[PDB]
């Protein structure tokens, strides 16, 4: 078989799988098949029999709608993705969902589809490789050495996140990142010149990339020469400008928007087979074509050689090797749990009224020596988010460091960190003011969807930040996080809940954790040993009465102090009241029914929520017969103490609103 | 007097107001003061006595933390912003909040602070000027002719949204957009070379901008020559690369991150006065410096000249001039309410089972001839969002058109449309798949904060979109919109509710409206005249019983049919059941309490919400003793019919959950 025939196997499988599903995207797989054949057969270092090989190259499909391209590649090269699964493309519980999903499918590195985020993930994978190589490689022992290859299209280039992450990739001189741009002139509205006219090569040169122009994306020799050129440039990420024809092979739909996102149709597929000279029936591949596509023997040889290298490394550097293995597996140090509990107990015994952003920094300082896998950063807010600890070292200064200055790039930061978590070897944390979670919002969602461990440090969480005013004062952002599937969100009320939340976040293996942290100092609360242990249950009884409470206050973060003051006033008047601290609604909801009943008993309807955030959220825990002391508006520019008074976060107002339930549930 | 003395008045007012507040940002106002002095005194066309003059130039401070720069300029040039307000910078209910806010302060064009969005707004204002000029100017009568000037810094340049909107500005050849980049080498983390190394001039030339490099931002002659050159380039937006020193004037904090975001301190202010040669006490400005800065006399002359031009236009083009005035004031045509009601009544009388995305297109088609102020578009999804009507004309093809191909740029699109609404003259609508409201989320928030009218057309709203799978299937996005202050969100259940929602959106005067639209066909519900009129109240009784209900279903959008099916089953068993359709929770919540009680009586606790979105939202209406048939997870890639079954959107499950309450 010629290279074109081998590439046409991808075209056939893609158009036929889309046709059988009556759904999906034939255009990009057909347009990029020749590029994929050269990259995967001539360059990609991988082992289909072990998709988790630590030193494999990473491939990312940023134009993720072209999912049949990667399913064809994985199937043809010998991964555990049988033809039956391709026949079940886009069907319930198949290993071939409409967009590729990490975990669903052997060999898929990331979940893509939302445009722009795949190239961001690839930038994170390349940062991870560079940093891990710098931390672990030793003279004569280069155990980390692999490339990151990405495909992307016009949509990814138009998205702002491409600017964020490719600018930063240029700064960091990511010489093992090689991206292929599917320059096919077509997007969904039609010919892109009506809305997309950038000199993209010049733009990427402005970022410090090595750009290869005018590659014939349907000519294997041209593509191969370009990839060799990119691999020879070791000090810059490379962009290959690949001129392709969307839907290549279809006489009537190639080069048209009609090939982008719908089945070609059976008549058109017959004509496409005739144009391509592809004789085989749908889902039929001859043994000779598998023989040229299969990567099991080469892959075995390469991983075997790497294992020999790693064994030599382990003999010369046994502690480093043990750390590499631990970190690539995502395992925690064996003594971490005990040391973290010792830290938390020390805080509970030694009160300090500090901002929870400072309590967060103190937890980073405490955990940092125990977690060399941290790869942390802030989006140009290190002095405000308090993300640096004494052991931080920026990777633009020393590549073996552990800290990233992300610049003013919140979305790019968060999707890069998704790439860092997907790579293995690190535990990323990211940070910005909470308001600007809105800039990064879909990357946060994607971390949750992909079940990735990442700690998101979001500071300056309410009107408590004061004079900066309503553009920066969060109101509804925490509610948005709380209703996100698989998101964990903590709003700690003091330095002890802050440390507990950080411990929870770094030990959470199957999804991300957002910390909602104050600008201003928070009072430490008294806790018994039992209460201290109950912080991690998300919601717990902090103050109580004998018998059934007449009133339960539910409070979070900076408002627990206010709720406790109201509880004290009411208790002194002879009212039976309880205070529940709710640092994490998601962790509380995961507790069993008996525990939740013990904290929020169904008999007690007179519930008062107190939080400087949007009020409507709290109907979930207060019901229709309680009260909510919350925000219902945007904030205002003024000193924070005047804002808390103006918006009702006062002991007198909280007590008055509570007493209306002693007056209403009565009358 | 001397231009440096005149610029130093901005420096003094800025450092002193920050010091008095013990809060704020002296650095960028001190760094950009010489640029501002040249722009405002020599070029900017404006009238302090009427900040709403239709043909004024628009100025945007995208690096909005530098708010004392714009307050100093407004005060010095004679706007209604007295010295007492500058002395009340960042104080409760002052006219000088920490970031500039449109409406709070005479002369402020937009609310900035979130980096990158000011330049986006300015691109929108320049698109509005270009389009309005093409629509209204006539030979001998150029009634629209003004510039859009923007200041921006490193943070705006790093943000992705700058790439989206400046790319599109190049495509649209916005020759009256002129941006000044405060190239001062400093951001909050320190010297920017550790994280920001772009050849920014080369980047902007890649967008098709005219770029002027190596301007000395502290030399009036350098700056003035650059502005003249940019104004002579009429077929490209221009970027002026202005080298400045942050905190210019401060001997110990100039050129450092220490001048970015905190008071300089009293000692350092004294040293700064010495270095600048500024001899005036805090909040002292001599009469001659006001005389040199004041723009009232020239401004009134220019606006009067324009009024005379407009009067001549109105004599030659009376209908066009009346349209111009109406649109610039943001008024609706006087017969729009009646014509839209006639359309809605027609739909109710002529049932159709269509997707609410199609019903949306049909409302655009009906309203299009009535609302020439539409300036609509989609982020590369016209064939899916259905944003084109028969009279759509793309502005990249015809500058006098009414449609924008925004490309794959959801955040930039939304903030550009905020600029369009701020400009006056237009009613923007934007569109993408609902999932990607998450890419644009803070610009949506900013439309609400700024009380701007924009209709946001979000289609493909649930697991009903099918095989595309969980990256695209919305679950929690509608709940996020619903709890945003001043946002209106509509999830119509058929073509009639879709038209009512569109009417509500275009008739809003003080905020945005999000339409949550289905991929798939939705059955039309039968309605009495009273029900039909009550759609606009956001929640209404769609199916009822005699007497107090025993069970109330609350449903939205594509799930109303499912709730009606469950109602029919329970009604046939003899249950006193009701179905409430809730297309807009915010419109419902604004109703009088007797109305809300008539729909959701407080004595009836057996309430079942049905919506293919996140369940947690609905506790607001069902409380603790009801049921919610909603989503609690991400979606899955499969045909939509199978997903609705898999996730419990079945008559059997809805009926079972209801019977658990009875
Ligand atoms: C952030 C985001 N916005 C919108 C979409 C919907 N969408 C999918 S592909 C596409 C444009 C297709 O353009 P391109 O990447 O050039 O596709 P191709 O040439 O591969 O078909 C759009 C708008 C998306 N997937 N992600
Ligand atoms: C989207 C967004 N992210 C973060 C911030 C916080 N912030 C305010 S100013 C700034 C950096 C200031 O850098 P630059 O624009 O270069 O400021 P300057 O030189 O004018 O002081 C940051 C990160 C913000 N306002 N908006
Ligand atoms: Ca394309
Ligand atoms: Ca700067």
Show the CA angle centred on residue B142, arms to residues B140 and B145, nearest 5°. Answer: 155
Tokens of A540: 């717990």
- Indicate if ligand 1 lies below 6 Å from the C-beta of A6: no
* Contact assessment for residue B541 and residue B530, using Cβ atoms and an 8 Å cutoff: no
| Concatenated DSSP letters of B241-262 | EEE--TTTT-TTTTTSGGGTSS
Q: How many CB atoms lie within 10 A of CB A322?
A: 11
Going by alpha carbons, the residue nearest to atom 12 of ligand 1 is A187
| Best CA proximity match to A251, nearest among A275, A219, A267 | A275
C-alpha distances out from residue B88 to B33, B70, B94, B260, B540, Å: 21, 15, 6, 20, 47
A635/B contact by beta carbon, under 8 A: no
C-alpha distances out from residue B437 to A379, A482, B310, B441, B459, Å: 22, 18, 40, 6, 10
DSSP helix/strand/coil, B444: helix
Residue ranges of alpha helices (H) inside A483-540 are 495-507, 529-534
Nearest to B199 among A206, A257, A396 (CB): A206
* Contact assessment for residue A184 and residue A248, using Cβ atoms and an 8 Å cutoff: no
| Concatenated DSSP letters of B95-112 | S--SS--TTTSTT--S--
- Indicate if ligand 1 lies below 6 Å from the C-beta of A67: no
Place of tokens 């007492």: B84
A452/B contact by beta carbon, under 8 A: no
- Chain Cα centroid distance, residue B586: 19
Distance A155 CA to ligand 1 centre (A): 5
Residues near B137 by beta carbon (within 8 Å), at least 6 away in sequence: B143, B144, B145
Cα(A69)–Cα(A66) distance, rounded to whole angstroms?
A: 6
C-alpha distances out from residue B270 to A258, B251, B277, B661, Å: 69, 10, 10, 73
Beta bridge partners of A240: A180, A212
Cα(A213)–Cα(B426) distance, rounded to whole angstroms?
A: 41
B160, A163: Cβ pair inside 8 Å? yes
Buried b (16+ CB within 10 A) or exposed e, A409-436: bbbbbbbbbbbbbbbbbbbbbbbbbbbb
Q: Minimal Cα distance from B633: which residue of A?
A: A485
- Chain Cα centroid distance, residue A429: 10
Q: Which residues of B are catalytic?
A: 410
Structural gaps in chain A: residues followed by a C–N separation over 2.5 Å: none
What approach was used to elucidate this structure?
X-ray
Going by the DSSP 8-state scheme, the letter that residue B273 receives in this structure is H
Going by the DSSP 8-state scheme, the letter that residue A268 receives in this structure is H
| Best CA proximity match to A408, nearest among B24, B115, B239, B112 | B115
Strand order in the sheet with A540-543: A540-543, A577-581, A551-555, A607-614, A627-631
Chain A residues lying within 8 Å of B90, measured CB to CB: 467, 469, 637-639
What are φ and ψ of residue B329, in 5° steps?
-80, -10
- Indicate if ligand 2 lies below 6 Å from the C-beta of A413: no
Cα(A230)–Cα(A18) distance, rounded to whole angstroms?
A: 33
| Concatenated DSSP letters of B147-167 | -EEEEE-HHHHHSHHHHHHHH
Chain A residues lying within 8 Å of B163, measured CB to CB: 160, 162-163
Beta bridge partners of B543: B579
| Concatenated DSSP letters of A97-147 | -SS--TTTSTT--S---STTHHHHHHHHHHHHHHHHHHHH-BTTB------
Cα(A652)–Cα(A570) distance, rounded to whole angstroms?
A: 11
Going by alpha carbons, the residue nearest to atom 15 of ligand 2 is B155
Q: Ligand 1: which of B408, B434, B467, B471 to mutate, judged by most atoms within 8 Å of the beta carbon?
A: B408
Please report the atom of ligand 2 found closest to the CA of residue A471: 25
- The CATH superfamily of B326-536 is Thiamin diphosphate (ThDP)-binding fold, Pyr/PP domains (3.40.50.970)
The 3-class SS string of B332-379 reads CCCCHHHHHHHHHHHHHHCCCCEEHHHHHHHHHHHHCCCCCCEEEEEC
Q: Give the count of Cβ contacts less than 8 A between chain A and B.
A: 329
| Beta pairing class for B190-191 and B186-187 | antiparallel
What are φ and ψ of residue A665, in 5° steps?
-60, -20
End-to-end CA distance of chain A: 87
What are φ and ψ of residue A256, in 5° steps?
-125, 155
Q: Give B500→chain A minimum CA distance, Å.
A: 25
Tokens of A127: 């940062």
Q: How many CB atoms lie within 10 A of CB B392?
A: 18
A160, B162: Cβ pair inside 8 Å? yes
| Rg for chain A, CA atoms, rounded | 28
Cα(A534)–Cα(A531) distance, rounded to whole angstroms?
A: 5
Cα(A541)–Cα(A103) distance, rounded to whole angstroms?
A: 38
B 484-503 residues inside an 8 A Cβ radius of A: 484-486
- Chain Cα centroid distance, residue A57: 20
Angle, to 10 degrees, between the axis of helix A3-21 and the axis of helix A220-232? 100
Q: Name the residue ranges covered by the structural domains of chain A.
A: 1-325, 326-536, 537-667
Q: Domain B537-662 has what CATH class?
A: alpha beta
DSSP helix/strand/coil, A509: coil
Nearest to B188 among A383, A485, A643 (CB): A383
Cα(A247)–Cα(A253) distance, rounded to whole angstroms?
A: 6
| Beta pairing class for A521-522 and A354-355 | antiparallel
Torsion of CA A362, A367, A372, A378, to 10 degrees: -40
Going by alpha carbons, the residue nearest to atom 8 of ligand 2 is B65
| Concatenated DSSP letters of A270-323 | HHHHHHHT--PPTT---HHHHHHH--HHHHHHHHHHHHHHHHHHHHH-HHHHHH
* Residues of chain A by 3-state class (helix, strand, coil), percent to 5: 45, 15, 40
Q: How many CB atoms lie within 10 A of CB A267?
A: 9
Please report the atom of ligand 2 found closest to the CA of residue B188: 11
DSSP helix/strand/coil, A464: helix
B162/A contact by beta carbon, under 8 A: yes
| Best CA proximity match to A629, nearest among A583, A596, A661 | A661
C-alpha distances out from residue B458 to B192, B422, B461, B474, B492, Å: 38, 22, 7, 11, 12
Torsion of CA A589, A590, A594, A600, to 10 degrees: -20
Residue ranges of alpha helices (H) inside A154-219 are 154-158, 160-171, 200-206
Cα(A422)–Cα(A102) distance, rounded to whole angstroms?
A: 9
Tokens of B15: 């450092």
Please report the atom of ligand 1 found closest to the CA of residue A154: 16
Torsion of CA A7, A8, A14, A16, to 10 degrees: -160
* Contact assessment for residue A146 and residue A57, using Cβ atoms and an 8 Å cutoff: yes
Chain B residues lying within 8 Å of A205, measured CB to CB: 199, 202
What B262-269 contacts at long range (C-beta under 8 Å, 24+ apart), as own/partner pairs, is: B263/B18, B263/B19, B263/B21, B263/B22, B263/B23, B263/B24, B263/B26, B264/B15, B264/B18, B264/B19, B264/B26, B265/B19, B266/B19, B269/B15, B269/B16, B269/B19
Cα(B32)–Cα(B242) distance, rounded to whole angstroms?
A: 9
Cα(A385)–Cα(A434) distance, rounded to whole angstroms?
A: 10
Cα(B358)–Cα(A499) distance, rounded to whole angstroms?
A: 52
Beta bridge partners of B58: B148
Element (H, E) at A16: helix A3-21
Place of tokens 């103050």: A543
Beta bridge partners of B354: B522
Angle, to 10 degrees, between the axis of helix B160-171 and the axis of helix B410-423? 70
* Residues of chain B by 3-state class (helix, strand, coil), percent to 5: 45, 15, 40
Place of tokens 């933390």: B65
Domain A537-667 has CATH 3.40.50.920: yes
Q: Minimal Cα distance from A186: which residue of B?
A: B380
| Best CA proximity match to B582, nearest among B632, B617, B547, B626 | B617
* Contact assessment for residue B153 and residue B63, using Cβ atoms and an 8 Å cutoff: yes
Cα(B655)–Cα(B651) distance, rounded to whole angstroms?
A: 6
Q: Which residues of A are catalytic?
A: 410
Tokens of B33: 């003061």
Torsion of CA A16, A17, A19, A24, to 10 degrees: -130
Domain A1-325 has CATH 3.30.1330.60: no
Chain B residues lying within 8 Å of A405, measured CB to CB: 189, 194-195
* Contact assessment for residue A43 and residue A289, using Cβ atoms and an 8 Å cutoff: no
Chain B residues lying within 8 Å of A449, measured CB to CB: 470-471, 634
* Contact assessment for residue A545 and residue A385, using Cβ atoms and an 8 Å cutoff: no
Cα(B526)–Cα(B596) distance, rounded to whole angstroms?
A: 21
| Rg for chain B, CA atoms, rounded | 28
Q: Give A338→chain B minimum CA distance, Å.
A: 33
CATH topology agreement for domains B1-325 and B326-536: yes
B94/A contact by beta carbon, under 8 A: yes
Tokens of A251: 């006489």
Cα(B594)–Cα(B598) distance, rounded to whole angstroms?
A: 6
| Best CA proximity match to B115, nearest among B424, B415, B413 | B415
B206, A203: Cβ pair inside 8 Å? yes
């Amino acid at each position: 078989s010629s290279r074109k025939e081998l590439a046409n196997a991808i075209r056939a499988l893609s158009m036929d799988a889309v046709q059988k599903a009556k759904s999906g995207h034939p255009g990009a797989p057909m347009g990029m098949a020749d590029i994929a054949e050269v990259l995967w057969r001539d360059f990609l270092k991988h082992n289909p029999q072990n998709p988790s090989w630590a030193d494999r190259d990473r491939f990312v499909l940023s134009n993720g709608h072209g999912s049949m391209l990667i399913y064809s590649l994985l199937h043809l090269t010998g991964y555990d993705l049988p033809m039956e699964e391709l026949k079940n493309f886009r069907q319930l519980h198949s290993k071939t969902p409409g967009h590729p999903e990490v975990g669903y499918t052997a060999g898929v590195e990331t979940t893509t589809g939302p445009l722009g985020q795949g190239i961001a993930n690839a930038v994170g994978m390349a940062i991870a490789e560079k940093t891990l190589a710098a931390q672990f490689n030793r003279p004569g022992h280069d155990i980390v050495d692999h490339y990151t290859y990405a495909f992307m299209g016009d949509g990814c280039m138009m998205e702002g996140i491409s600017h964020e992450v490719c600018s930063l990739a240029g700064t960091l001189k990511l010489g093992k990142l090689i991206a292929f741009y599917d320059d096919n002139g077509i997007s969904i509205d039609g010919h892109v010149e009506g809305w997309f006219t950038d000199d993209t090569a010049m733009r990427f040169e402005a970022y410090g990339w090595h750009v290869i122009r005018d590659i014939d994306g349907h000519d294997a020799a041209s593509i191969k020469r370009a990839v060799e050129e990119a691999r020879a440039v070791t000090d810059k990420p490379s962009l290959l400008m690949c001129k392709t024809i969307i839907g290549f092979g279809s006489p009537n739909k190639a080069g048209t928007h009609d090939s982008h996102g719908a089945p070609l149709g059976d008549a058109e597929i017959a004509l496409t087979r005739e144009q391509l000279g592809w004789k085989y029936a749908p889902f039929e591949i001859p043994s000779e074509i598998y023989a040229q596509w299969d990567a099991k023997e080469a892959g075995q040889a390469k991983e075997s050689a790497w294992n020999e290298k790693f064994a030599a490394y382990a003999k010369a550097y046994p502690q480093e090797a043990a750390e590499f293995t631990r970190r690539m597996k995502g395992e925690m140090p064996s003594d971490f749990d005990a040391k973290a509990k010792e830290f938390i107990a020390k805080l509970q015994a030694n009160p300090a009224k500090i901002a929870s952003r400072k309590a967060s920094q103190n937890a980073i300082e405490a955990f940092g020596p125990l977690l060399p896998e941290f790869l942390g950063g802030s989006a140009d807010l290190a002095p405000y988010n308090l993300t640096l600890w004494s052991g931080s070292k920026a990777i633009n200064e020393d590549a073996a460091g552990n800290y990233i200055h992300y610049g003013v790039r919140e979305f790019g930061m968060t999707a890069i960190a998704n790439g860092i978590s997907l790579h293995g070897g690190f535990l990323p944390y990211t940070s910005t003011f909470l308001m600007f979670v809105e800039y990064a919002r879909n990357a946060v969602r994607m971390a949750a969807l992909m079940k990735q461990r990442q700690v998101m440090v979001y500071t300056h969480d309410s009107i408590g930040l004061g004079e900066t005013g309503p553009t920066h004062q969060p109101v509804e952002q925490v509610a948005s996080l709380r209703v996100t599937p698989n998101m964990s969100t903590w709003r700690p009320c003091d330095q002890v809940e802050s440390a507990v939340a950080w411990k929870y976040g770094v030990e959470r293996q199957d999804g991300p954790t957002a910390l909602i942290l104050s600008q201003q100092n928070l009072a430490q609360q008294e806790r018994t040993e039992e209460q201290l242990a109950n912080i991690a249950r998300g919601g717990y009884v902090l103050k109580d009465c004998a018998g059934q409470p007449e009133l339960i206050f539910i409070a979070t973060g900076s408002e627990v102090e206010l709720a406790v003051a109201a509880y004290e006033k009411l208790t002194a008047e002879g009212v039976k009241a309880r205070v529940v601290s709710m640092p994490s609604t998601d962790a509380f909801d995961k507790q069993d029914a008996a525990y939740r009943e013990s904290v929020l008993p169904k008999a007690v309807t007179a519930r008062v929520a107190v939080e400087a955030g949007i009020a409507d959220y709290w109907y979930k825990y207060v019901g229709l017969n309680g009260a909510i002391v919350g925000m219902t508006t945007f904030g205002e520019s003024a000193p924070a103490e005047l804002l808390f008074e103006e918006f009702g976060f006062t002991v007198d107002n909280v007590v008055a609103k509570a007493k209306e339930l002693l007056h209403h549930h009565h009358h």
